[PDB]
From a paper:
Topoisomerase V is a unique topoisomerase that combines DNA repair and topoisomerase activities. Topoisomerase V is formed by a small, ~30-kDa topoisomerase domain followed by 24 tandem helix–hairpin–helix (HhH) repeats arranged as 12 (HhH)2 domains. HhH repeats are associated with DNA lyase repair activity and 3 of the 12 (HhH)2 domains have apurinic/apyrimidinic (AP) lyase and deoxyribose-5-phosphate (dRP) lyase activities. In addition, a 97-kDa fragment of topoisomerase V mutated to have only a single AP lyase site (hereafter Topo-97(ΔRS2), see Materials and methods) was used in all crystallization trials.
The 38-bp DNA oligonucleotide was redesigned by making it symmetric from the center, with two abasic sites, and still containing overhangs (total length per strand 40 nucleotides) and led to a different crystal form. The structure of the symmetric oligonucleotide complex shows that each DNA fragment binds two protein molecules with the topoisomerase active site accessible and occupied by DNA. The two monomers are related by a twofold axis, but this axis does not coincide with the DNA sequence twofold axis creating an asymmetry in the DNA structure. The structure with a 38 bp oligonucleotide revealed that the noncrystallographic twofold axis passes through a base pair of the DNA molecule, making the 38 and 40 bp molecules sit asymmetrically in the complex; one half comprises 18 or 19 bp and the other half 19 or 20 bp for the 38 and 40 bp DNA molecules, respectively. This asymmetry translates in an asymmetry in the path of the DNA, even though the protein monomers are identical. For the 39 bp DNA, the dimer is almost perfectly symmetric with the two halves of the DNA identical. This is not the case in the 38 and 40 bp symmetric DNA complexes, where the DNA is different around the abasic site in each half. Despite the small differences in the DNA, the protein is identical in all complexes.
Residue numbers in the entry:
A (entry chain A), B (entry chain B): 3 to 852
DNA sequence: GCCTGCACGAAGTAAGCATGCTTACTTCGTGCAGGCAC
DNA sequence: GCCTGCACGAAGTAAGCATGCTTACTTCGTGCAGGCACA
């Protein structure tokens, strides 16, 4: 029934009892491990060393049990299986310790362990009821454990005297103890074998086990009474008790060492303490008592229920949290009156939801609990049944309204489903769970037969119906047939082109379904495009494939050049290999011309004119005038960093100083030509849009209405365009009718910055500081962005360090790695030894790689 | 900006115009492909064959353009770029076809293609304004296209007469025609070069391009007027027209063949039709109009909006669906009055939700749309801001209530969050999007600072907080610290044991967090258990690992035997390899003894006594009596199918007959021993529970309350137990307060049958028919279950054919495969040739394998 | 609750998977500056 | 006036991944028989 015990001793006594109980638990764990070694291998079974180790563990367990509660007052209200052992020990002549009188019973340690706050998940089991392999007489052993005779309890199998085992009758006759006829009949059988089970004794004597044992008191009849009568007349040997207490601990550790030695011999592996605890738990798990302890521990940890109330609930409901969650509050209070309503709500989520989220009374909620078990039960129950229960007076108004609102909300939470449509769906198909099942079964026509179920309702209910119906030519019947045939939009997409054609789908429909419109731009037919998508994934990766692999499979060189986006001036100049290599390494033809030299381009196989075309238009215009020379033009462009602006923004005297092989007479002409070019630059696109042009641009971007709204709010379309150019996001948003979508339509990058989690003011500041999100990515530093008032997460997301930061790296180190290695993929493929040299942890590098 | 034209002709005329326009599109695609081949490779550029092919394509394009609208009435309301070409051609003296007069202008084909319902995604471009490489005179070519002179338009470059090209003035002098001084000044320049651009003509003559060209009518001034005056006076050559119509199509296919021949030479790959369409799209993307067309087609395909209204919306909003979805119905009707409210709701999901799901008026919804763009805007807007707008009279009551209900629902959809708590959260943190962001940032204390936010609210909002706080010793501060440090419960779980210990977590806490309770039962410490979970996933897979791999990594043989659950009589008999093999193949030691023979067990390395122990206890008891012999005992057990019951249920005369080698004297004693054994069976277990025992069993199973309710409803606990034993699921469920959970608590297998989707009556019938779900799986047939009223899906789910049915196989064939090959894994590893012999398709076997 | 391994059966439970919101891997369409000219 | 080349960045698309939820995938509960062995 109930196991409980209260500790009334001091803190020192509490710690002493804790240590004693833990040592006894270790001893009994040694007992159990020795029994497991006995049963595991017959080779170890045929070994007296294992048996002597087992018996030594039993003796140490008995000693530590005798050492429990020496003052016989540290514990009170000791209850085992419902029996109050306090009063029972009070009604005895010799009295004694109720804690020890409980520990001599099986599972009685559950009462003492609760009084000492021992972690029940370690299973602190202490049992002293060994009979077969007990080196002592079983009843004498139990009586010594009860009376706490540490002096008489041996700690070594060799210290066991025969007067306590085989020749036990020697000890009785030594103290002149009166014996009745029943105890004489017990002794006449015990003389044959002192380890005879009490069941066999009661069978042969024609009595009950209770009659054979008797009360554990000298003033009774039975073997327990006889051994108590013998023990009480024995004086306490304080010296021997002190010696056993001093010796038993090191002896226990020595027994553990011997156990590990025997395990490493017969099994070639040791039995760890955690393995012993887990095996003890696996053994005890078969018992409803341990299931109750586990349920109470879960109620304490997860739901925060008090220990006593959690134990009461676990006892009353066989340790079934699922059953407690379907039990009404009135029954919970009947079984455990100390339970609080808040604890009942925490354990019963249905009750909690009904009370708090719906304002129901406890009884009104218990109504729904009794009638439908859970919220899932309410969602599965038919609305007609609920209405009938309400009409018949069997369901209260509050509970009925709550159930109807729940069933309706479960459907109205979807887009396009109103209250009327949800009620019609409930009338048509019983319950929202049935509606969900019909949607899973793709019963699209059956769902659309109900009034209110439109295209939006179908898209929100049936998964994949939106993706199918959004294709031209595919109607509702065709989408339903495809879904029911293949088993989901995923399977329809995984289907083959030939079978999709067998279903009657157009090649355009199959292309739109499989998303291979670009792959069919690269490759002629749909079959090979689908094969490429299956093999490599995306057309982007297909383009990223190397030149040799692309020439394999069956692509021409011109096809590969079109795939990799090789320009004409780079395709017709070199071969495909070197052209694609240069393109993949530098990105742009202008970057090629800036990095690689004219002589290098010539050495790679370029025409002296094609090499100049690969060189910048600045180089081309330089070579146009007289007295240039390719190397001198290269030197000039490296001095002005390939920039006609910086070339013209210089005096010819300064120009002749920077360059190594050039005179003033030529520098004058060079600066003149550069200034002529920059004069031809204002004659290009220097015009800033006029009023009508800004008006038309606004009407294009945000529409006629919002454009007129902006023009009326501010001065004119010119002022609106000025605000747009200066990225006045806040001043644009303050206009009624102008929102984030319109601002992002006007201000480029605002949408990306908002998706990154930035406030409009933060996006405005970042744009005013850097220009665009591209320049932010290829420039902004984490310290700069922190000085702009941004958080580290926003900084990582806007710079692209999202994956590296998710790999448990700070923004600073992620930015350093990305800056050293170039790309995030390059950091992920970076050398592990190089990362270790940088100073990253092993687990950090493992997370980076995975 | 607007392109439109309406077709009023009959079905035959519609098909004729469709074919003519498609052939003209093919001809212009050939033109563009020839130009692409000219510019792609200089080797192909230096080839007159490609130029001749290009000119033939141009001539065929001109012919097909002349062949459009022969009756001059098939089209009406022709509008191109805003100009009404119907009225423009009506105001001319010669009249003509407005469709043909529009196609001579750039992009005018967009008007004609809409009248023929041609898929605009193919870009049906037709342009007849070639100047440089035009084999004919450009203005004469355009005028022939204008007046539809298919007879005068040549179909072959060799058929081109010089009087239509170099010596074009010969054709003018053939018809005299009066000419004015401006056209004479144009002719004096055209004599120098007939292909002089109109820009150059207007530049040299000091006039405008419009003044040089003139109206395409004889009653005007310009080169167009002159050529029209010349052409009108030319009689129609019906014979040449009919011959050209008969000849041009096959000529076009021949030109396509020549184009593919030239492409396979200079590029080693052909130009597919889809590639040509994509290149046309890439060219036309610079004309921005295609952006509008794509938006209109998307509005047609997804939301089912009419073509004209979709085009109007895309024009008015620059083809931005995100912008149209944020535009109110009033503005949508102002820009496109033909739009319907249902189409506006379909395109604006916010408007649809406000109108239908919330019962708002169109104006009340346009209010919220103007003020907050979208439902996301409302969720991002502060409740204080909405209340202020309502108080100041700037927001209507209906719109205010709708916005408040939306903001509240977005939070109350979570468990534990009531209306009061949602309102308090809105007051505290502005908006539900801010609440969601705070929950993502693990601001657990900041959220709990609000009244009403309890443990359930925290568990429902913060993901993983429940999993963390449900562990003993872990408090709110520790859970918040762990979440904010690692970045989610997933990362906390992926964290290492050493760093979790560095955070101060107990080993028990780390075990409960990582779910390594079984792996730490197999292996001693936590580090190796976590490594095993990382490498293999689950202890189940660790057990499934082979013997060699298990001996690797560092497991002992006894450890492997404990892992694989090898019995003692099978572990001590053979070696680990053969023991684990036999166990994985047969399951139980009794199955080993029944299948394998005594001689086989001996051949595998078993002791003559260990082989008998591996054999059944029936075999052991048989060998107990005298004069048996192991082979004779095997024969007896094979005769009685290893069943002492069937052995005792026989006469010794019948016993001596079945086995081939046994006498009557021995059969008598065998039957005697078997009957003695079955007599020793009735004293073991047979007691049908008494009344008090049934009462206690009910109190254990369904609880005290429901047990007493059942005992009162029915006769007694005995009757309740009878109902349970006979699986009276319906008769138990009819009791108020008894539900599926209690029934499954009483009736084993009911929970599994219900999770399989079976109604309680179906589960009751299946249980009454078969006994248990185990026997259903190991016995029930699909035909039997269909006769029991079950569906094929339920049959598959209850028999375990779920994966095979998901592999697009019917239940009958899936059951046949599972019966023949045993297991689903065996069907997967089955021979592909054997499956083909069975008669499965290639794709079917592929789906089985994958 | 002798005691737990051996075996089976079933959902208890927790690993593996479907699902829906989120987020750029990938599309994919736009803007614009030079460069030869139709 | 096209054409090519590159930069830009939003979501059109389509995978990424968190977060919930199935079910037998993985664990847990029960009966029994003979050995660890007792009400
Ligand atoms: K080359
Ligand atoms: K606004
Ligand atoms: K806790
Ligand atoms: K062996
Ligand atoms: K009921």
């Amino acid at each position: 029934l109930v196991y409980d015990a209260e500790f009334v001793g001091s803190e020192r006594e509490f710690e002493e009892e804790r240590e004693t109980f833990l040592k006894g638990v270790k001893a009994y764990d040694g007992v159990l491990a020795t029994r497991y070694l006995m049963e595991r291998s017959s080779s170890a079974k045929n070994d007296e060393e294992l048996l002597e180790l087992h018996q030594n563990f039993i003796l140490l367990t008995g000693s530590y049990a005798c050492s429990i509660d020496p003052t016989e007052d540290r514990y009170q209200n000791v209850i085992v299986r419902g029996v109050n052992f306090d009063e029972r020990v009070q009604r005895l002549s010799t009295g004694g310790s109720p804690a020890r009188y409980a520990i001599v019973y099986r599972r009685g340690w559950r009462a003492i362990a609760k009084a000492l706050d021992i972690d029940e998940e370690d299973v602190p089991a202490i049992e002293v009821r060994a009979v077969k392999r007990n080196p002592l007489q079983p009843a004498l052993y139990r009586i010594l454990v009860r009376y706490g005779r540490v002096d008489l309890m041996p700690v070594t199998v060799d210290e066991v005297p025969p007067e306590m085992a085989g020749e036990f009758e020697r000890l009785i006759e030594r103290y002149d103890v009166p014996i009745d006829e029943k105890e004489e009949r017990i002794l006449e059988i015990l003389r044959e074998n002192p380890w005879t089970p009490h069941d066999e004794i009661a069978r042969r004597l024609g009595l009950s086990v209770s009659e054979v044992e008797g009360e554990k008191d000298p003033e009774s009849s039975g073997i327990y009474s006889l051994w108590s009568r013998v023990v009480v007349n024995i004086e306490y040997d304080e010296r021997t008790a002190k010696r056993h207490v001093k010796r038993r601990d090191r002896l226990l550790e020595e027994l553990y060492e011997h156990l590990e030695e025997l395990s490493e011999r017969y099994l070639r592996h040791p039995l760890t303490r955690r393995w012993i605890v887990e095996h003890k738990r696996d053994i005890m798990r078969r018992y409803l008592e341990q299931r109750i302890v586990e349920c109470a521990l879960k109620l304490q940890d997860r739901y925060g229920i008090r220990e006593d109330v959690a134990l009461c609930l676990a006892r009353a409901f066989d340790g079934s949290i699922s059953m407690i969650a379907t039990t009404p509050y009135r029954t919970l209070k009947d079984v455990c009156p100390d339970l609080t309503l808040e604890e009942a709500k925490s354990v019963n989520r249905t009750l909690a939801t009904l009370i708090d989220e719906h304002g129901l009374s406890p009884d009104a909620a218990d109504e729904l609990i009794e009638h439908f078990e859970s919220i899932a039960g309410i969602l599965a129950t038919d609305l007609e049944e609920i209405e009938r229960m309400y009409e018949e007076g069997r369901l209260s108004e509050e509970a009925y309204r709550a159930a109807v609102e729940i069933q309706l909300a479960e459907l109205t939470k979807k887009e396009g489903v109103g209250r009327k449509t949800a009620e019609r769906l409930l009338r048509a198909f019983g319950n929202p769970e049935r509606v969900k099942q019909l949607a899973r079964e793709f019963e699209i026509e059956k769902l659309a037969s109900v009034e209110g179920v439109g295209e939006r309702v179908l898209r929100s209910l049936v998964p994949g119906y939106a993706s199918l119906i959004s294709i031209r030519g595919i109607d509702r019947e065709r989408a339903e047939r495809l879904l029911k045939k293949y088993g989901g939009y995923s399977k329809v997409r995984e289907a083959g082109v030939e079978e999709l054609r067998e279903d009657g789908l157009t090649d355009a429909q199959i292309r739109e379904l499989k998303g291979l419109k670009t792959l069919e731009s690269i490759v002629g037919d749909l079959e090979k495009a689908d094969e490429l998508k299956r093999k490599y994934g995306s057309a982007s990766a297909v383009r990223r494939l190397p030149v040799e692999e692309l020439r394999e499979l069956g692509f021409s060189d011109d096809e590969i050049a079109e795939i990799k986006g090789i320009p004409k001036k780079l395709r017709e100049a070199f071969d495909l290999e070197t052209a694609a290599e240069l393109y993949e390494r530098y990105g742009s033809l202008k970057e090629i011309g800036r990095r690689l030299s004219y002589d290098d381009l010539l050495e790679l196989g370029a025409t002296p004119k094609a090499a100049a075309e690969i060189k910048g238009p600045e180089f081309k215009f330089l070579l146009n005038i007289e007295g240039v020379g390719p190397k001198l033009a290269e030197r000039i462009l490296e001095a002005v960093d390939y920039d006609l602006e910086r070339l013209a923004s210089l005096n010819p005297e300064e120009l002749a100083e920077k360059v190594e092989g050039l005179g003033e007479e030529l520098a004058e002409r060079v600066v003149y030509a550069a200034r002529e070019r920059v004069e031809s630059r204002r004659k290009s696109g220097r015009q800033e849009r006029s009023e009508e042009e800004w008006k038309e641009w606004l009407e294009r971007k945000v529409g006629e209405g919002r454009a007129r709204r902006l023009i009326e709010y501010f001065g004119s379309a010119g002022e609106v365009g000025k605000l747009v150019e200066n990225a006045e996001v806040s001043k644009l948003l303050e206009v009624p009718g102008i929102g984030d979508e319109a601002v992002a339509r006007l201000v480029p990058g605002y949408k990306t910055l908002r998706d990154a989690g930035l406030t409009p003011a933060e996006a405005e500041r970042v744009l005013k500081r850097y220009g665009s999100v591209s320049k932010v990515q290829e420039g902004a530093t984490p310290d700069e962005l922190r000085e702009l008032g941004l958080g580290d997460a926003k900084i990582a997301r806007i710079l692209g360090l999202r994956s590296l930061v998710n790999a448990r790296l700070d923004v600073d180190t992620a930015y350093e790695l990305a800056r050293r290695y170039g790309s995030v993929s390059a950091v992920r493929a970076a050398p592990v030894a190089e990362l270790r040299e940088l100073g990253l942890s092993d687990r950090a590098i493992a997370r980076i790689a995975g």
